[PDB]
Structure formats: structure tokens, C-alpha cells
Subunit: 348 residues, 2 copies
Amino acid sequence: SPVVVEREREEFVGFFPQIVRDLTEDGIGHPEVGDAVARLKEVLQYNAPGGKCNRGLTVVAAYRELSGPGQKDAESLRCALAVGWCIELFQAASLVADDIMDQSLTRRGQLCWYKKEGVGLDAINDSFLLESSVYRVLKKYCRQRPYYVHLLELFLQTAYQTELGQMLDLITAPVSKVDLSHFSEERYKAIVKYKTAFYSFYLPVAAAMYMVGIDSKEEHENAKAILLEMGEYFQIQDDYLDCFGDPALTGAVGTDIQDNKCSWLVVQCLQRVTPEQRQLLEDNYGRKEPEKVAKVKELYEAVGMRAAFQQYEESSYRRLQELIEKHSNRLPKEIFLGLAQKIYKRQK
Amino acid sequence: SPVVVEREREEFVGFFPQIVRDLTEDGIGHPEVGDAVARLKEVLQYNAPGGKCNRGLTVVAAYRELSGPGQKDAESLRCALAVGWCIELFQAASLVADDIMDQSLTRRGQLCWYKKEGVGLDAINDSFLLESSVYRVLKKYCRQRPYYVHLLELFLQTAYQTELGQMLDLITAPVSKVDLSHFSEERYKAIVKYKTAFYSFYLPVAAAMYMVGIDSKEEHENAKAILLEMGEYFQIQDDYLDCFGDPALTGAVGTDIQDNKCSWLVVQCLQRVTPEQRQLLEDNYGRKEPEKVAKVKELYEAVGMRAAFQQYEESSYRRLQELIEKHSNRLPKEIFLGLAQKIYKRQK
């Protein structure tokens, strides 16, 4: 529901300064480090805010579907928000780093933090601080709570998992050289499982689970199961909406495949190929040549990926509705649905 | 004692593969991420090992001075080592990053990991993984131990503190522009308090304190007090031994002040100056010009820093022997001494 979804939406956003005061307020006037904490504010404000928040929001919603009448005090509700901005600072720490290693230019419609003159390679250390900001906020909100260690272990573990998916990516599709040898489906599914799925789906729900006390191992596994198919499919749909999409498109409906970006479409091409066609690609693909690009998509339409998407889309839903069944024994399905109802949109 | 000091020394080093198997063994054959964990091994082996180990060693020694007959099982002893290699992986995560932001060339007599062809800016993510390796090892060795959360909180907090000292540094002495305006004593003392003191002295001892159960807040403060003067003085002596030293010098007795490096010597010059002399510097200092450099040190000798070092040296010892008193009420002085007996060497 708009009315509700929005309300939650706005309560989240409106909480940012708070996290901001948290992180810096007392640091701001320190006779020693005050200068540092002062640039920290800037980094925080430049980078953290401004995305969609779906990720952090997912926590709040989840706790709301999980908590009982008992646990809806205002305090509890603030931790949910706090714990929410945590995934939000986590992701920002990512993006910053990631922009340097991709030598990107823009993000969130801003110029990449590293590109800001005077900054540069210092952003290397800023993503580090953004990272520890995450643990500062938990110590501040969750320190005396039965689930503190779990959250700490939760965040840390996913940090690792995602860094490997990042690592995988970085090896597979090196941003200064084409080579489509390494573009396998297992590898794509694997780049996707670790670089975003874990922190984008599982993490948010897993945090609300432990916060209501569901620490059952095999309950984190029922969760991990459904959620990870969601996340995979989510990646895939982005990839699709990336080139074959437009109508109402989530702001910037621009692109990239000039940056030899290993995507499901690409992988799906390589399977419906001919050595010749492969060569069509092999050469061109990963190019910032207007004409070349166009041809590349001729290729995709040439092979009809437009169809395959709808083919895949039509399966993911199904598998989901089951996986819910196989996995929503103990936890409220409303969660997975809600989550799902805003993922599956489809756009062709 | 050589016999003992060495023994501990060698027990530490000989434990590395172990940490190494820990971190990767099961990652090595994963159908999904195996490739990643495999490069992780390389990163670990390239970077972690090979320094002096004083830092990690300090833990082992400390626990040995702290534990009672009860806690000297072999298991306990392994955690001390494990917990030791942790500061060692912590520092490596640092150095890697730091080499990129200084655009350094060499380290530990190896070529900087980022400089290795094929690597590059990917090292950005490798220092991240080196970082999470630290928390992997604690979860593995300390997870079911009364002091687990403290250690986790300990490491995380210092990670932050040091990142600010790094941040301070990066702003003060920007590696592509001279400006000696920002070279204050309070700032140097502050760059030193956060970028190394905390993780190089306090962290090791603080980890052995909590491991024997000394979690008393004001006992971490008695510790923090003495140790931080040690660390400061340690920095200062390096700075000194940097230019005015040689005889037996800890391997490479080369240099840097070509990289406009904010050091105690420099700061100490600016105080014994003349606007003219300041100009001698202002221009030259931070140069990779054979002749220029020489002149710079004329300046330091010109002003006689050779004397001031010995002046300062002669105070640090004193203040120490007191600070021990003011602070070694509850904890064994042997610790601070031992620590100290291998710091104060002096070299002129």
C-alpha cells in the first residue's frame, strides 16, 4: 500500500541526520581528531543518502511483520531503523570502493566521490570509515540486546562473502580487456550470489529474524533459500531492463556494456551462438562505439533474448511460490510476498 | 633473553600456514568461489608474513605474563598466537591500502602488491579481504570464550581509530603538494596517536588483558596511559633513526622526506626556525633531488636536532618509569618493561 509503504519510506529517510549526529556529534569538536570527524560528516552525507532505501527499508518492514505486540516500543522501532541504515552504510562503503576500481564517472547522478578534486585515492580510506561506521551504529543501538553478537557476526560475514563475489567479478570481467571466455552461467550465477544477493536480500531479513529471536540455524536456511532466488532473479531483471527496457525506467535509463560488463544477457547470448556470432561479439562488445553497441543488441534481438527473458521470468515466479511453500513453514509468508511484490514488476 | 625471545619468535612464525589453512582450506575447492579463495591464499602469503612480528608477538608475551598456571593449556596458548596473527593481518590490510594512496614502490623489500602487474587497483578489495580475515580467525579461535565480544569490539574500534589517524595524515601531508603550514606538534602527536600507537601498542596488550579477564575499564585506561607514551616515543625514534641513523640499522637504512613526510624532526625544525630557514625548507623539502635533501639535513644539523633527540629520549624514559608507577597498580610491570626494553634502544 502506497500510504503505508510511503510512511515507512519517509520515516527511514527522515532518520538519517540522526545516524549522522550519532557518528560525528562528539567527534566534531575533538581537540585532536575533530578535523577528521568533520570530513567524515561530509563523506557520510555525500555518499550514504540518496538511493532508494529498499534494502534498509526491508528490515523495518520485516521486523514489523515479525515482532509481536510486545516488541513495538518506540525504542525497538528505532533499532530497526538504525539496523536499517546499517545496510545502507554498508552498501555505500561498497560503491565508493567499487567506483575506484571501475574508474567510473557517475553515480546516483552525482560525480563519484573519488572524482571530486582534492579527494582522489583518499576515498580508499573513506570507504573504510564508512565501513566502520556500520559497527559504530550497532554498538550504539544494539549493544545491550540479546542479539548483538549475532548482528555483529551477521554483518561481518556478509562483508566477507560479498568481497569474494566482488573478487570473482574483478577476475572474470577485467575492466581493461574483453575476453568472453570467462563468461559462464555458473560464474554469472556465482558472481550474483555473492556480490549482491547476500547483502541485498538475505541480510535485511536475517537481521530482523535474529532481532525477534529467530536464531535457529535451519531457519536462516529456509530464509536464505527463498531470498537468494529472489536476489538472483532481481539481478537478472535489472540486466534485462538495462538494454531492452525504458517505459518509466527508474530514472536514468542510460547504459553500459561499453564496460565489458558480464551480464545474464551476454551469458544467454553465448549459449545461443555460432562461432561466427561469437566473433561478432568477441571483437566489438565492451566498446564505447555508438555503432558497435547497436550491432551488439542486433545480435541479442538477432538471437531473440526478448523472448528468453519472459521465458525465465515465468519460471522464477513459479519456483518462488513453491520455495515459499518448501520454506515458509515457520516464518510469515507475508514477508517474502511483500518483498516479492516489488521485485517481480517485469517490464516486458 | 635471546633463547626465550627467539623461541617465542619462532613459534609465532611457524604458525602462519595454520592461519593460512584456516582461512582457505575449505574455500579452496568450492565449486562457486574456489577461484576467489585461491587468490586469497596468494594475497595472504604475499602480504601478511615477513615483517618483524613484534606486534603480534607482544600478545603472546603478555598473556604469558598474565595468565595463571590454570590458563596455559595448549589450546589457550594457540589463541594467543591466533589472536597474534590477527594484529598481523590487521596491519597488512592497512599497508596494502596505504601503499596505493601513497603510490609507493616498495615494501618489506617486495614490490607493493598493487604494483604487481594484473593486480593494480584490485588491491583495493584485497585489503578489504585481508581485513575480514581477521574476524574470521577470531570467530574460529575465540568464538566460545567469555571474552569474544570484547576482542571483536576491541579490533573493530581500533580499526576505526587508526583510519582517522590515517585520515588526519592524508589531509596534513598531501603526497602531491608541499605546504608546511599544517605541520604542527599537536597534529604530529595526533597523527601518531591514532595511526599507529593504538594498534601497535595498546591493542596487543589490551587483547591479552581481556583474555585473562581484565576487562576493568579503568584498567584499560592504566594500560592505555603507559603504552601510548611508548608508542609515541617509538614513532619519534624511528623518525630519528630515519635520517640521523645507520650503524646496524634494521635492514634498509635508506630513506624518505622526498615524500613530504610529516615527521617529528621536521616539526622540531619549524620550531627552532627563522622565516628565512623556513623558506630554505618550504621550497626544497619533499623533493627527490639528491642535492636538495642533503641541504635539508644541513638544516637539521644546522639547527642541531641531533641534540634535541637525545634531549627528548632522556625524558621519555623518565616519564615512563613514572607512568609505570602511576599505572602499574594492578598489572604486572614486567610487561611494560619487557615491551620497553626493546623499544628504547636509542641509536645516538
